[PDB]
Design a protein around this ligand. Sequence first.
Ligand SMILES: Nc1nc2c(ncn2[C@@H]2O[C@H](COP(=O)(O)OP(=O)(O)O)[C@@H](OP(=O)(O)OP(=O)(O)O)[C@H]2O)c(=O)[nH]1
Ligand SMILES: Nc1nc2c(ncn2[C@@H]2O[C@H](COP(=O)(O)OP(=O)(O)O)[C@@H](OP(=O)(O)OP(=O)(O)O)[C@H]2O)c(=O)[nH]1
Ligand SMILES: [Mg+2]
Ligand SMILES: [Zn+2]
Ligand SMILES: [Zn+2]
Lengths: 521, 50, 76, 49, 38, 50, 149, 351, 142
Amino acid sequence: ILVPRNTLLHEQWCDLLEENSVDAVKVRSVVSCDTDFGVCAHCYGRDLARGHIINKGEAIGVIAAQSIGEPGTQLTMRTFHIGGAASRAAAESSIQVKNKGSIKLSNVKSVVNSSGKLVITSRNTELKLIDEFGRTKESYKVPYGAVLAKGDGEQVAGGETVANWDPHTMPVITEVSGFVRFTDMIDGQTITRQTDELTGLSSLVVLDSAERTAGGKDLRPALKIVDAQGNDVLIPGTDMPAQYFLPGKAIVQLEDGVQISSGDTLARIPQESGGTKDITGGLPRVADLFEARRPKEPAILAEISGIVSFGKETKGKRRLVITPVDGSDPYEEMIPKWRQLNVFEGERVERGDVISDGPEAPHDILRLRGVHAVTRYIVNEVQDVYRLQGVKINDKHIEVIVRQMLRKATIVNAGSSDFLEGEQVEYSRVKIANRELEANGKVGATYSRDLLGITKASLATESFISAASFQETTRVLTEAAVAGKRDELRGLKENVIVGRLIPAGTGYAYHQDRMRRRAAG
Amino acid sequence: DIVLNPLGVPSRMNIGQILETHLGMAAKGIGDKINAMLKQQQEVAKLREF
Amino acid sequence: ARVTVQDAVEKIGNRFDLVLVAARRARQMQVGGKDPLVPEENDKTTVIALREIEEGLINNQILDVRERQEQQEQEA
Amino acid sequence: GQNMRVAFMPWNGYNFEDSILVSERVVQEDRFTTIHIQELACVSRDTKL
Amino acid sequence: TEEFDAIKIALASPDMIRSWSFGEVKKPETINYRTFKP
Amino acid sequence: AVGRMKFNRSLLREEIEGSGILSKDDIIDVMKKLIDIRNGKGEVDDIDHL
Amino acid sequence: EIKELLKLGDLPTSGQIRLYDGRTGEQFERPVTVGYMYMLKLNHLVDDKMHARSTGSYSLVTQQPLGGKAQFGGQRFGEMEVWALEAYGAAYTLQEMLTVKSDDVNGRTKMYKNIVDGNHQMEPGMPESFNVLLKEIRSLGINIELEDE
Amino acid sequence: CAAYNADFDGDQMAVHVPLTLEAQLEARALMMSTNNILSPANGEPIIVPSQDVVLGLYYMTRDCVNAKGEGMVLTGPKEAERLYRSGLASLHARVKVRITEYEKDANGELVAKTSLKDTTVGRAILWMIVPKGLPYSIVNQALGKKAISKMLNTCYRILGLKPTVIFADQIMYTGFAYAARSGASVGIDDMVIPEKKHEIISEAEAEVAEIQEQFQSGLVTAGERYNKVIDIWAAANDRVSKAMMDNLQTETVINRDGQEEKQVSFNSIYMMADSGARGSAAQIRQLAGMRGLMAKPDGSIIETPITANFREGLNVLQYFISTHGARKGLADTALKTANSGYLTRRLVDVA
Amino acid sequence: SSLSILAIAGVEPYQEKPGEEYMNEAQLAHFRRILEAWRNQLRDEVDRTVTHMQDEAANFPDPVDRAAQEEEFSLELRNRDRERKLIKKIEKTLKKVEDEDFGYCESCGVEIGIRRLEARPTADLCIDCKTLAEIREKQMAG
Ligand SMILES: Nc1nc2c(ncn2[C@@H]2O[C@H](COP(=O)(O)OP(=O)(O)O)[C@@H](OP(=O)(O)OP(=O)(O)O)[C@H]2O)c(=O)[nH]1
Ligand SMILES: Nc1nc2c(ncn2[C@@H]2O[C@H](COP(=O)(O)OP(=O)(O)O)[C@@H](OP(=O)(O)OP(=O)(O)O)[C@H]2O)c(=O)[nH]1
Ligand SMILES: [Mg+2]
Ligand SMILES: [Zn+2]
Ligand SMILES: [Zn+2]
């Protein structure tokens, strides 16, 4: 141990942390802070006009808002789309190690081929580089199907090509050996014979329902991997008999009758995937990012885990059915045609893996991946805009904002609420603590977080005098008058309006005193 | 008479004031030369010629 | 100490109830119930109270303890 | 206006920003002294008192 | 000066409206135009 | 007279001065020119011109 | 042409001359540009812009101090300034600024007397604008009462 | 002023008086100028020198190939200053000086290390100010805007606030003093038109002629002609800009005892640029280079460029186009600020 | 002259041999080299721009020079946007070259001249169809 549990990290601790080669540090963030009705000193930290740990009472909300608002005039008043993305990967095929380090694979399950290469069949694979003293110098993302040259552990010299693959090509990879057997692979019914001479080339197109004749609508053509004896050979270590549902345009090079070695590419399928990350920036993009506007055609994710499969063919949205191996099967989601799919039918996806390419809506990130993922995404995404113009802001402010956006949840279980009401997470958390400390569950109640754009979040204020101060006065006044709502003021702007002591800073003690004098003798 | 900050020229791309200063200095130089030739009261001819 | 209040915050780490302590002391000085504990430099009672806080001679504990002491003395 | 002898140079940060330094010689001669003629009105009405 | 908190909002009942008011304003006249007394 | 001058100029008529009120031939020619520009035998005008 | 005309005057053709620092007498390095430029005195005269107000006339309905120059004036802390003060822990300055300094009648008079007497205390009261607000909302069919517990 | 974003061109400020005793304390403790030097956004200092100071320090610390008192050995910084003020040595001239720096090596103890460094006269005179805890290395360099800000930062990190405030004030005073003693100004001949401007312009025009010839041959419709011409003009503009800057920066070919050498020039405008006081390469370009291509209202880029510079004189058309661009920017600025305010307000309302 | 698009790369104009077939390995390689050089140059220019933009941006206290410093940025970003739009066209042309379907008009099967491809390597149509389409476009637009 070089750093005891929660210690404020001042410059000298950081220097010590640098002399070693620590890579990743868990830091308490304001978003995950547990205290209701404010935050805790520790989760926030020091950074201010002074040097010290935050002192109890300072109004961090308006500090963060002020810091995020003062800049925003260096930024151009448009939405310049330079879209260059200068530093690419030099090419699209081969990887280029920058510094001599150990090669280390993250999140993959490779399949050694016949020459003995670890052909990767995982979509979420990363290939990092460990330096002399245990640190990640280089990091690269290798897509599905890339043959490797050097595997895991062996040291790669400076500028050695460690991976290679055809960009515009998603390979279908066999895991086990034996003869390829054709299933529903009829000539004319499901495929179109375009054949070459001796060397065995083809341009077979697996036609969808529209281009298939009237009989081949439901016929799922497949490539069965059987052995010499007949029984379906199982993928190594798993019981699934590999039934590769050849998607549209599966150019089957290795025809029926050629003993495939374990790891040979089954059929070339052309995919002209866009290889550039157009940079976006300027002010309005920030406003839109902070307003959590559902983006344009959003990319899609998986909801539950389990082997995916297709469903009712070509009605105007092709079906995707995720069936959980253990849990209940029945989650079918319709999907538009223009979406390109990353996974084959007979594949085992995990919940929240990428299924389509494009931009993810923060709402999906929150729902599937959870809080820390959405907060990291927002923070990084805005911070990229702000650094693009060279305006430095510390992340903590953006983080407090993100916390304000997640203020609300929606209850799906029951026990004391209305079973569907959008309710503040604080009331739910206190009632859950109460119930669980008491003997009775009631039930319950399970909730899910929701993300609101800063405007709506503002509109969801409790005290009505603030909302009347900045919202359509008539509406809030009318609703609060009918509801008989009772304002304890509890806030800053309320007290301003009444001309008494704001509960922040020098006056917190006063209000703290009053709190003890209330509900007392 | 007046002491003006130079750092205002290059970033404010108004360079005309500098040429204005030069040409005005030259004009006052002429004016001085005439004042000098008059204070000595040389002659009509010489002032006229200049 | 009318330049940097850093030593008072080193004495009292809240940096806010500091101003309340200094206000209590300086108002105890204005309405002449007490006298300055530091030789005045023609200063007003604000920076006098800051100077008293920063040297550790006065804080919240000395104000409350000495206040109840003088109160119980004045009871007679 | 009027034409003055200017020198472009920093003089102990008294012209730090776009501010301008000026010599007593110009004020001595009264060459930037303006005359302003202001109007004042006193009106005597008849109240009911 | 009272020490208060919790500001309450509700529809005013007609008997409350009578309660606050001290008198009924029956005629639209404002002032005497001769002597500007109300 | 200016309005009429501009109106007749837009529809390519030699006649400069008209009767103030809209003759119905005017409206018909207007719709003809509108469907012409909709077909593409003309340019759209900008209200920026001086 | 400027070079030519400057030569006709017998002046340095580069238009810079060395200057001596009038305080110390030392020469300046790197000769400096001198010459005549035509300057103007604009209508923004400090004589008019300077303005201060301690106490003066107040407004009829909302008992705020009048804004302007003919009447003494009295600048105005807006929401942005409020936010600035809130950013600090500065609660008492905000409190006075909001009530005793503008809208609280009793508070402002009591503070005048306290200042004259050489005592520095305060008595905030209710801002008059808020009282007006109560009366204005109550003018509708909306009951807004200050509760107690 | 940097904190206020204030400029002295008739901008006004308001002054309020805190009345109560508690208000006085809150103002003096939390709100006092000296207590808030660090920006609330990031930890770095706000009060860094702005423009004139930085110019003065740049001039004072900068080194020169040859001057008065080359290679003299001085017993300390005070003697360096005595040498400069007597006129027996130029304010910047390479010299060997004995200096005693202090180090926070122990548990907060100062340990004096005292040895001979190779520095400028100016750098020693500046070293006089620096408080004890700082390593000499800090001032030994060019000392521009970046370096000066880093200097202040380290002073803050090692000693604390009190000394950093005093050091900032000292830096201001010294910078102003030596900026005034330098006497830097801006003459018409200080902005040198690169010798090779018209050469590159003639090349670009020959290329446009070739592209016109290859149009008449019928390999490109008008659109390709427009795009291609615009691209060649952009490339020519960047090349001329870079050539002018090359001419400008290192042109002082000053001679040592015998053979000659070349160095970072003392061209007043160039120092004003490089110190980070005002101006960037682009503005120097537009004064001494060709002010590139310009855009009409609609966003479309006019094919023919200006090729003129403000040192030279523009003509009617070129000025007109510049009006297009200028007024477009000027009209956009107002709206932009008025909407950034709104964004900030709806961002403060939530938190 | 070192200012065209063949200049960016160190290549000099090709020269079809007497009995040279149209699309051979060498021509396709040539065009790939040309496009790759052009692209890499454009992206390095974008990197320059971004470094400049990141260094300069500051808060000016005068509203009539903030506009001055934000009226050159608008033009710069305009040029950068245009070149970004051309990077997608170059990418697509690189896809046609890799697919070995490069050099012919998309409307009519006629092959596009070699000299025109050395002129504007991203050409998609022949001069005739290009002109007709440009007229139809300009007419349907205005
Ligand atoms: N910015 C700056 N400040 C300087 C400089 N030189 C001295 N000071 C500070 O100004 C104050 C000097 O005030 P005094 O000497 O007591 O005389 P005074 O009656 O006018 O206040 C001191 O701070 P103090 O209020 O007395 O602090 P403390 O020592 O009482 O805690 C001193 O530290 C300087 O060069 N620059
Ligand atoms: N630097 C550069 N950019 C090119 C070049 N060629 C095309 N572009 C940009 O890419 C855009 C795509 O042009 P296209 O739609 O393919 O039309 P095109 O066939 O005539 O090239 C162009 O639209 P555009 O309408 O012409 O842009 P704009 O006029 O709206 O600014 C232009 O902005 C080029 O050779 N060099
Ligand atoms: Mg101004
Ligand atoms: Zn916490
Ligand atoms: Zn064609």
